[PDB]
Design a protein around this ligand. Structure first.
Ligand SMILES: *[C@@H]1O[C@H](CO)[C@@H](O[C@@H]2O[C@H](CO)[C@@H](O[C@@H]3O[C@H](CO)[C@@H](O)[C@H](O)[C@@H]3O)[C@H](O)[C@H]2NC(C)=O)[C@H](O)[C@H]1NC(C)=O
Lengths: 147, 189, 188, 188, 189, 188, 146, 188, 145, 145, 146, 147
């Protein structure tokens, strides 16, 4: 169900826009909590990114809010649109692993943004090499959590 | 200007000016005593907080962003007064002062008593105000006691010869706080 | 009558009809409990007076001519009620019953307290009345506790939301006795 | 006079010479402390009677005709001594002084105890007398302690070597009051 | 028959019949309780003595020759009664019983009181005896109370109408122990 | 975790998932108890915090951004257990459960006692361990008291006849916590 | 020492840059403490701005920090330079009034930004009407604080 | 010797040199105190023994043949010290001095505590020794409280930074009495 | 059942004898208690007098005691007869009101005598004017007490 | 300084007037207190009488009070004159004994009157027999009190 | 069952042997407990001895122990044999009186020996006067104990 | 100062008499206390006996009492007489060692008597071999006490 166009969804436009969010934020000593997959439990590079990327999408609406019609709001609208188009690029794993490998972080908005950008950057690189990479059965990796 | 009523939770703040800083600031809160003396309430650094034993349960400290909160969990009269917050980053120290006002809402009472000698004709009505900081009582015409909780009580008597000029008005005050007491009629005709 | 206020000296009287007599009458006083139940306070005959130990210092008796006095040295709430004086000459007896009302003048108190949750906007004003026999409180609008001394306390609360419509008045009553407590402004 | 025993009701009297008068006299009673020192007990004028709080329930006052009474409800040792009644009519004053004697009847006790060293041969008999005003003990031959109630206790010991010459008598006295304690035989 | 007065040191003995024996005998002393029950006071064997904690300081045990001493250090009323001494040599046991009498010397008191109603003419003289074991009082004519120390008190009243027939004699007894009380004259003529 | 030692300040956290919300969330923390009851510790809404009177001074609550903190000011043994945070935004409620482990570090004691009957040749050595939650003692071979502070004490005895095989070792544990007591020699 | 030139310093380019700082901030419930002029105490519009302006430089440096050569960082650099130029336009009031009329706020970064945007915006508008407006003597208004 | 442990029955002896005498000797035992005073414990003569009231129940005296025994019924710390027996036969007195050592066996305790400021990385472990007469503690390296019962307590602290060099050993001594405390691991 | 007899039933000799009692008593501050008609409760002069009269009968027996055959005893005996002669000149009112308007007094012997004299003095005055005056229905007056 | 006048200084009219006082008083249980001579302390009839006499002067003023011009007031005024006429028939004894043999009484008005009457009644009897009887030296009698 | 022979059993040799036991004991303040006849309770001389004699055999065995073939041991052997011979001379009294008139003594060994010497000595003397003396009926005297 | 007759003082008569005391005592569980030199502190055979023997003599009068003119009293009188005659047989040591090596015993009269007999028996044997034996300087042995 993944096909060749999976290599040609995430563009440099999306990434540049992610850098924009980061570059525009005021530096504060301020912290929010959010979920994210922890790299200490999910070490396999493909599966970490597979899970991570899907998590970033369904966390986006709650964690990445800007005023409507603003450049960053528009950037977020485009990432979300892009998520829907990536649908068939990730094959589903066992639903028992939905809450698996996930953890909360009490960090800065800038630090949230760094994480999201890197998941994006790395998910794009993988897809550019192999449009079929995320058809990987990730169940064994997900079960290894919480190790 | 921060004011708390007796028994209330109340918060005092200080802050580091550089908004991007927070957990790096060593924070210590002091209660200022009557000789301009500093008594250490507690310290905070990297979201590790330690509250000195004499203050444990009465005060707490937390941070959010560049802001440093002193929580008094249930304001009591002893807590009225000044506080000092010392913040250090490396060799650089800045201090902030904060006054806390603790107020106990006034209680106003009225009662009376008639004389027993040479006869029963003189009525003495008594008006009492308890409060903190400044209880004040007064009868309108035609010594300060210290309580165990830290509050102050004051009382005035008004003696009325027969026939009793009633009603009589008593005015009690804390600061802007105000109550009246009226003695309207005695028990017998 | 008679009425005494709490702490006052008060006397109940009885008498022998034949004015010619006095010391020869055996006089006994009783405090009437609840009920059909008489408790000996003291006796007097030929100018010898004996007060039962439980009433000693709280009551006394004396005579002047044909007149007999039950003196209460400092009226307390327990003393409120009926009394019986039995007067006995030889085989003939006459009894007088007397009622004594003990009153404690009322104490009215007003104080206020603001809410601590969900905000500080609600002002609760409390009005307390202590009295005997009949304390009564009420707030004028737009249970009972027994004290160690035998008196009664009653309290009412009035809650005001923002903006507080001050001043507010509570009326305290005993019977005809009346006092007001008025809350005029908060501290801010 | 007058003499009261501990716990008894007793009255001191005073009077106005003009028999025509009574309620119009301002009457005040004083207990005379030591000394040149007068302590107000109570006042009476026009049939209003007020007893000072420290004496309330221990003393009362009443009038019959030209006669004024200071009643002590239950005599205790402190009440023993002098009293002054000041009687005042207009500008003219007459004072009466009265003495009240309070007596506690004596308690005499006898008990014995034998020696524990160097042997058991020596019998010590102890005689104790409690009284007021004047307890006195003595063994008939071949200091003072103040109690909470104001009375005095005194004790004497008599040691008997073998053979014990029993019986032995101690005499206890108050003034004219006299009792004996006699130890007749040991237990063996 | 051994008798001790309250507060006295007193000794009870048992012995081994064979005079050449002593330290070899296992000795245990018991206080006999009201159900013929044995409560262990203490044990002795080879001049090692152990006194049970509830009895420590109140009783001690020692030996000399074939003789075994139970010392009560200060006789109190609870100690009145029987004791049992069990002696064992190998399989052979013999027991001795000993009764201890504890006696408290009697106290006799006299006092009086006149009536207050209908008049002051009746004199009531009171005679009281405290003692253990058997206090007894009695007025000579022309309820038992239990004290905290274990002793017993008894009292009799004699009411005398005017004119008072004085002197009056009161006789108090423990067992053979005897005291008299005489009321000779009242305070007033 | 989270694990706290006795006396330590410790913190439980909860959060709202929409990062832009904070004060709007109605927050309430409960201590869960035997076996389904929830006891309200306190509430927070719009930065107004009210701690229920029984928990006052023991617990506090504050907000940071979308993050909510339960502070237990000095962990005591009663605080060991589950907690529930209830977060409400109008019609939506989300719930978070959180367990706190309170731990009292172990105390190990050793002392000896020689026998007094029939002779002094037996040494019994005693090892005591007090801890929370799981004190456990034993002697290496060649009765649970519950304390005022909620902690547990256990003790074991070892009896050595002559000649005594010293040294002897006791092993005390909490969970992973371990201490030894060694009795090396008697006094003589 | 103010002049006609003062009417020509705050350009609408500056104000758009302030709006971009605002529009680009992510929405959190995060709050920070900062010191600013008490609008409850300084009611007078001219005097409010005179005061706000003596705080705006330090406010910027301590509160509005961005990564270098970033558009928002550059905007702050240009707002800093503007504030040097505008120096000429405000006459100094008594030094006794340096710490007067000031207040701490515990607010959102977006709310900080809006306060700052408003100073510049009202300072521009006042100055468009009267190049000399901020030569007003504000010693009395300051004295009325608290 | 003689040495007794706390709580033990112990015995001091004295004798008369003429073996045929026994009851005839006047015996008295004294506790010697700071620094030359002699306090009479009790007397014995002709098998009559009287123990002074302050020592009653703590000490007793008995005779065997020509041999005299001081029994201390339950050795407590105050009993540690010198004793004097005075033996008198008419004009002749002979004296014997005797020392009693009372010993309280040591208790050794170990417990740990992690730091709370500026972080939780420092472990300080505490070793306590209570004994009589000479408690002494120390830590093997890579403040004397006097108790109600007359015994002494001493304590030493050792502070370990991360990573903690466990196990650590404490050494507790009385005199020849020795115990060790070993802290093997923390809880985590 | 009144008549014109009532006009001069009470003579001046009856009054002189009353005033003799008053004149002959010793002035002391002695007080006795006695039941009499309450003047605050019963203000109407006619009804007061009617009430007082149903009481002076008993009053005199219990309160005014002199030794047999004495001048003053005699004057009481005659006042008892006078009152027995006056029983027709007052008509009866409801028996429910037999205790109404009555009150004890703790007063001087002389004060009692002043009271008793004024009953007779004031009765005679009204009786001189209208002999039928005490046929007045006092049920309402007594009822107001 | 006595004489044979004293034989009939006190007439029977003086006695009748005393008995009139007694006859005219109301019988009550009222008691008053007054100082009089103590009969237990002072048993001798002659000296009792002498003592009592130095007291009835004041007694009458303070204790026996009647309104001006009344029959009984008059009888007191005359008894005051009689006593002024009797001051010569009693000779003075040491002033040290002015308070001796004296005692208060808490008694009835009538009992007081009985006392006062008997002073006069018993004086007259002895005075009828021997007119010089009250020249008796009572210093020793008074001294025994 | 007593006879003339009874007058001839306790010889002065026995009594000298008892005196040798006495004379040979070292003087100590040592005391021992033993059971013997209460002389305060049995006053009657004949009955006292009748009773003492029913105790003397056991008394000897338990209280008067010497090393074998020693002179004092031999003396005890001969006093034991004598007591068998003297059996005939005492008639038995009620068994109800076996434990009556008896008392413990806390005394010196020399004092024990003297008690024993006295029984034999008075038993000899009584028996020298009347061979039949100890056929007395002692049931009453025994009953008077205590 | 010791001479040859020191070999010929203590006879078998004295010893037989000591056995008599022992043989005549009643067996009791009874104990007295007395001083004696302890064999644990004084191990040297000669010096133990030298000290022991002298101690037995000056302890005899207090510990070995019989009625006057009794066979055992006479025996004791003879032992005492014998002690005086032995005077010059024991040369004196340092007076500082008077109380040395001595100890109390809480034992039976029979046990006292056994000890005395053995000191006698052994002192006689030594003297029979060497009339000069007790001229030995015993100071070194006495100083070794209390070891
Ligand atoms: C109001 O007045 C009454 C008396 O009319 C008071 O009651 C009396 O109180 C006294 C104590 O002051 C009681 O005497 C006590 O009795 C106890 C127990 O039997 C005894 O142990 C004490 O030594 C003491 O004598 C007395 O019994 C009681 N009398 C009656 C009739 O109950 C009462 O206390 C007063 N109430 C108040 C609040 O003042």
């Amino acid at each position: 169900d993944p096909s060749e166009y999976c290599s040609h969804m995430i563009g440099s436009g999306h990434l540049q826009s992610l850098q924009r969010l980061i570059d525009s934020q005021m530096e504060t000593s301020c912290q929010i909590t959010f979920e994210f997959v922890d790299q200490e439990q999910l070490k396999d590079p493909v599966c970490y990114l597979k899970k991570a990327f899907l998590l970033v999408q369904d966390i986006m609406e709650d964690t990445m809010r800007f005023r409507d019609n603003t450049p960053n709001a528009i950037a977020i609208v485009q990432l979300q649109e892009l998520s829907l188009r990536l649908k068939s690029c990730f094959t589903k794993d066992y639903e028992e692993h939905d809450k698996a490998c996930v953890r909360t972080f009490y960090e800065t908005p800038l630090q949230l943004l760094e994480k999201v950008k890197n998941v994006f950057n790395e998910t794009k690189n993988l897809l550019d090499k192999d449009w079929n990479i995320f058809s990987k059965n990730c169940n064994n990796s997900f079960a290894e959590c919480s190790s | 200007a921060v004011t708390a009523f007796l028994g209330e939770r109340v918060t005092l703040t200080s802050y580091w000016r550089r908004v991007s800083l927070g957990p790096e600031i060593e924070v210590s809160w002091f209660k200022l005593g009557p000789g301009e003396e500093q008594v250490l309430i507690g310290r905070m650094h990297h979201d590790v907080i330690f509250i000195e034993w004499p203050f444990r349960g009465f005060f707490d400290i937390h941070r959010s962003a560049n802001t440093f909160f002193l929580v008094v969990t249930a304001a009591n009269i002893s807590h009225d007064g000044n506080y000092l917050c010392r913040m250090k980053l490396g060799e650089t120290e800045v201090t902030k002062q904060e006054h806390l006002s603790v107020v106990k809402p006034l209680t106003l009472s009225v009662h009376s008593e008639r004389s027993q000698f040479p006869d029963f004709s003189v009525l003495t009505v008594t008006c009492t105000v308890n409060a903190f900081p400044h209880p004040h009582v007064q009868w309108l015409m035609p010594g300060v006691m210290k309580e165990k909780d830290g509050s102050l009580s004051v009382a005035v008597d008004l003696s009325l010869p027969k026939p009793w000029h009633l009603p009589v008005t008593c005015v009690g005050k804390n600061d802007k706080e105000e109550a009246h007491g009226v003695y309207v009629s005695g028990y017998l005709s």
